[PDB]
Ligand binder design. Sequence first.
Ligand SMILES: COc1cc(-c2cn(C)c(=O)c3cnccc23)cc(OC)c1CN(C)C
Length: 119
Amino acid sequence: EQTPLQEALNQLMRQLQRKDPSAFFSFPVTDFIAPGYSMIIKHPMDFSTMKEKIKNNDYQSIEELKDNFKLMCTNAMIYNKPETIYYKAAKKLLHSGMKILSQERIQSLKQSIDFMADL
Ligand SMILES: COc1cc(-c2cn(C)c(=O)c3cnccc23)cc(OC)c1CN(C)C
């Protein structure tokens, strides 16, 4: 049993994950695979945590999910240097994600979500 907001967040989530076919951003970055990551990135974020926040109804607006998505890409652009494949994939993912999470699309969903309340 999910609210219209939760289901809209999951559809956007699945569309965002299709822009990351390499699964670079599907799971948290550990210190084991990236030394000093916990000491450099103060607010780590990844697709798995965002999906967990959706299922626990932690997200309030699509904008909050969009803020986490921006944080996810910018984190990779701080820890990784501009030549790295992680930096370049994060830059491309962020740009694609901003078109998906555009104010135009966030709006069509806000109306449909609202129309599913108050009968
Ligand atoms: C959690 O798992 C993975 C994380 C990364 C990964 C991501 N980001 C954003 C980074 O900045 C990063 C920085 N240094 C080293 C690694 C990463 C890469 C993976 O493989 C290439 C896997 C493993 N498979 C799921 C694909």
